[PDB]
Amino acid sequence: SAETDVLIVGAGPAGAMSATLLASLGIRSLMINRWRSTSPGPRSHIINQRTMEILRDIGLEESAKSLAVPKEYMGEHVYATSLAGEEFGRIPAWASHPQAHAEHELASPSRYCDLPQLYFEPMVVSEAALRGADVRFLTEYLGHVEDQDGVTARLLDHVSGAEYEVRAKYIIGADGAHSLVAQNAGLPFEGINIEFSADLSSGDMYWMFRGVAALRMNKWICVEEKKIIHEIIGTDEIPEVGPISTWTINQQYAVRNTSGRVFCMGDAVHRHTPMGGLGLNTSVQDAYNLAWKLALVLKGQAAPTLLDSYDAERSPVAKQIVERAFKSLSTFPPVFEALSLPPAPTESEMAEALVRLKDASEEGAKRRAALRKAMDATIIGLGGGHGVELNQRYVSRAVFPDGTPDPGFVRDQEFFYQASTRPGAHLPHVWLTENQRRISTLDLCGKGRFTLLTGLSGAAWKHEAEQVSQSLGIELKVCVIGPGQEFVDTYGEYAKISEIGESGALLVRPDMFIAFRAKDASREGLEQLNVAVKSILGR
Amino acid sequence: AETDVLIVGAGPAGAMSATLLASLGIRSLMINRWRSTSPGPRSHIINQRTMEILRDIGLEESAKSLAVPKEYMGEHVYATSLAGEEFGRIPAWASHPQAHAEHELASPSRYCDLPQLYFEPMVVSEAALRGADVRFLTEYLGHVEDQDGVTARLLDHVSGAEYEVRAKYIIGADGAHSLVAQNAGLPFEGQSINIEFSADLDMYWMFRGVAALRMNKWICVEEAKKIIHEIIGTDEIPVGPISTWTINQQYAVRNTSGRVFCMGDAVHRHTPMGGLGLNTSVQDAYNLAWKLALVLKGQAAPTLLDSYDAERSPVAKQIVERAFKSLSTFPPVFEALSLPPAPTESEMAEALVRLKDASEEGAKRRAALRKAMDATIIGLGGGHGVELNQRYVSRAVFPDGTPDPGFVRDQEFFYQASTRPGAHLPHVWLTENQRRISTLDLCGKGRFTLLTGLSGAAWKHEAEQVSQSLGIELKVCVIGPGQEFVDTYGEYAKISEIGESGALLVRPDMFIAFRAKDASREGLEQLNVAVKSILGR
Amino acid sequence: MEILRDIGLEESAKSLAVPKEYMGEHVYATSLAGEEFGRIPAWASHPQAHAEH
Amino acid sequence: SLSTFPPVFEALSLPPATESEMAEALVRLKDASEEGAKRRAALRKAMDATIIG
Ligand SMILES: Cc1cc2c(cc1C)N(C[C@H](O)[C@H](O)[C@H](O)COP(=O)(O)OP(=O)(O)OC[C@H]1O[C@@H](n3cnc4c(N)ncnc43)[C@H](O)[C@@H]1O)c1[nH]c(=O)[nH]c(=O)c1N2
Ligand SMILES: Cc1cc2c(cc1C)N(C[C@H](O)[C@H](O)[C@H](O)COP(=O)(O)OP(=O)(O)OC[C@H]1O[C@@H](n3cnc4c(N)ncnc43)[C@H](O)[C@@H]1O)c1[nH]c(=O)[nH]c(=O)c1N2
């Protein structure tokens, strides 16, 4: 028998990030994993800005960057018949087009990077243990029972062969795409990788229309006597040929992610195809949504109803990414159609298409233009979906509305990020300075606590926040941004992005979402802080 | 539970043993009492032998990405305090151009500064990935040995349960108060407050007797921590975590008892001068693992394991005595300033004014101070010979009849390459498809390798016979023009000390076990007898 | 270079030049595509020569 | 320093100036005999002596 506050079943990105955050917040956790090691395979490698912002908040962004390939080396996607064959063209993937890159820089202090899951996992798992989480591998969750005060789970130890029980206040189901935890909580659902080595002496990612195969990276992956590798390369005048692995995926999202004291996250609540690099990133963001809420509830600073916001905020995103990843698959077949090929052409059919594509006729021109259109429409799955990645819009009892209408989106909300300071949107990034060194708005906030941002004519917020803090027993850090202060609006970018007057305030949750906005520091405005915070905390 | 090897401890020694044993196809269970890898500032100087090991197993590039390269380690400063007067500087970690050349010539690898805080998780994750079972919050309580194996009792600090593990061997990698070594009855001979802090202010030695300062975040070596003031030393700038290390200087005279092998701090406990501890501990593991693997696979006799004590015990004594002796180089600095070992602020102020005296007496003091500062270098990068000049004598090294050539220059300060059996294979650059590759990169990977040139082609057939007969892999590399590996710079011919048709047999740990002068019939016939002798067969 | 340094042109010279790290690989061959006889460390590129430099 | 180049041709057993003669020299330089090892060593020695220039 063991006892903990939270039992975390699974030590992939979702579980390991939950353990790390809970341990940083002073909460006792036990994280288990069935297997001997972290994940070995080529799996994820695209890390998006929201994940990198989370790592930045907890102090792991610089270690992530030292293991990763920066964004400048991710842009060249090549569409071809094979590596040696004819190139159809290229596309600027991962926001490498100058305009896309500007939109990227404006959105976040962080950037895309290429960091194999193979490295990402042990980095976060070692951090969880260092910060205080108990971590135990070769240990399998078999089931649990729940009562009025907690949960009791049965675990099988694969080193000793012993079974034992663990008693917890809450269980996190971070146990992947066939989650037993989710099955036991009764959650409702709706909806070949080949490593090899070779010297390819004679861009960053190749899409081969052979229907579609992918090739990247001495060591290579494409997606046992594997002369699929020939064909893709495609010659046989060069010669390894394994390890080989498979992923069966059945597209489904949990409609609800919570049942009593059980919270599921990650692939356990969203299972989808890998198009867009959304899985690991969304899974880490699920953890970041939940952990601070658990910590407040366990410390008695919030009522248990604060936990209802997890489902209300993260379930819509589960459905969104599943549908989006699926839709992005449909953008590849039109490439074959533009060449006047069927989805699985013969060698003779392909050969004819290549000659036809170079024809000096009007028919040839029509095909070249159609091919370019089709290739351009794949970018939604390969870096174009910046809006999908960033445009979270939360509606829950952990976001206190300010009475303003939803302004919607000026441009397409899938392709383009739109900054907003309305409650329910992520705090916008802009550069300020601290001692003449650039610092992001995001660097003022987070660290497991609420933060209130204002300017010099909003000095009354400091005292108002101290009262609410004292009264509710919760930390509220106040930052008064302006000339001569600790943090300075050196570029004028804060006044430009805040959408409110200098004396207004933004209350920012530990996960960086705006929970309350006030237009000014009038007595009526100031009195609302205490009512918003009580409402957010269910008190 | 049952495993081939139980590894008690997951520091550098244990984690490296687990990684190597897993890479060799051996089942192991590595345990650690605590929840995490080591949190503290502890080791940070990684030497070339350790970096070579990481290179052999494919972790050198990951280590380098986490580390600070050698170009940022050289500036050691001797002073009264950070804001006070500087006595002078010394080129530490082989940063002087001549020391740097000697360093480059010795190895494909380089010093780097890599905190143990990052080193440990990198190796522990690799061990699990490659097949080791790894289990933290698990404590070794004791064991009993019989003629077929060992049975250990473990306490699980998650479940509170005790259970037993059955193994063929136990590795005691359990640190400076090793319970394993105490239970194996090993005989021993031979006779710091670290303060982290943050402040807005490469290495400072403060003669205040001596304090060190390095690195927003700083370490020097809880409101009484205005020791930090004094060292900085002002208080016009605005104090934990604090930690202690007791070390009692001791080395194990023997490192093995029956089926128990101890390694690392468990067999060599010493002061931190010279950055020898972690490095020596990783090298103990690299000596043992391939031997254990051959024995467990039935390709070597159990007597191969006797060479672990014969090769590694002399190193244990050597580093303990060396680290201690380097401490004695600091007090002469106070003596050159004509100060007592703990001077007052007034006495030191007077020493500083005398040190600038425009007389012949002042010039004598300036020269004496320089001489004393220069003699500290043996503990701060000067001991390249100590780091690299391993000379093994054992049944796992087959002598070639030649006398020991000794050392032309001082064997502590200077590395001397040798290809005589019992010395480390020398590094030189060859090419493979016009890309530079080290001699070391031809060898290792858990197996024996035989190196020769084009007139030594007969070695290929001889090695095949021995390999087939003994059931062991022997990779043969024929170095020359038109071959897979080419002597593009001529450096192999220059370093090998034998004719082109001679051969060097290199062990999995990169030590030379056999050398042949030529490929005559008498020379070729010796291979099989050397390999049998090395394997105890 | 010492002369250029004395008169204040060394940094301009360096901005126009290729540094010493890119001068060492001298290759002896029958032709560029043919067989290579071997290489030599030119312009003090051997580590000992570089130290002396 | 000019006089250090001709010993390279001599180590290959070539005269100072045909394509056939050179082709033979490259095959002999890979010869597995003790004579081939002598030629490889002589060639290296000759190449090394050009470093003065
Ligand atoms: C080919 C490919 C390529 C990509 C991606 C997937 C695939 C298949 N993804 C998605 C990503 O790999 C996936 O979404 C994450 O691994 C999900 O992380 P989780 O922590 O939810 O599950 P994960 O599956 O990673 O972890 C589940 C954990 O639970 C453990 N477990 C299961 N049952 C257990 C039990 N009963 N008891 C104890 N432990 C148990 C498992 O052992 C494992 O540790 C991605 N994403 C992205 O953002 N960018 C990208 O580029 C890609 N690319
Ligand atoms: C301040 C300072 C600074 C330096 C150094 C030391 C110190 C104190 N060193 C030396 C270096 O840190 C030391 O030599 C190594 O950590 C030794 O590694 P081990 O694996 O042998 O022991 P280590 O002590 O690292 O690990 C022992 C393991 O066993 C575990 N354990 C103990 N008893 C157990 C039991 N009964 N059951 C289960 N687990 C148990 C412990 O929890 C731990 O995992 C160094 N070296 C260097 O090369 N360069 C440098 O710069 C420095 N600097």
TrEMBL record, chain B:
Top-level taxon of origin: Bacteria
Ranges where the FAD-binding domain occurs: 2-323
Keyword Repressor in annotation: no
Gene3D superfamilies reported for this sequence: 3.40.30.120, FAD/NAD(P)-binding domain
Alphabetized GO MF terms: FAD binding; oxidoreductase activity, acting on paired donors, with incorporation or reduction of molecular oxygen, NAD(P)H as one donor, and incorporation of one atom of oxygen
Transmembrane residue ranges: none
Sorted UniProt keywords: FAD, Flavoprotein, Monooxygenase, Nucleotide-binding, Oxidoreductase
Annotated residues for binding of FAD: 10, 13, 32-33, 42, 116, 140, 265
Coiled coil: none
Protein name, UniProt field: 2-hydroxybiphenyl-3-monooxygenase
Name of the gene encoding the protein in the UniProt record: hbpA
TrEMBL record, chain C:
Coiled-coil ranges (or none): none
Signal peptide: none
Domain of life: Bacteria
Organism ancestry: Bacteria, Pseudomonadati, Pseudomonadota, Gammaproteobacteria, Pseudomonadales
Protein name: 2-hydroxybiphenyl-3-monooxygenase
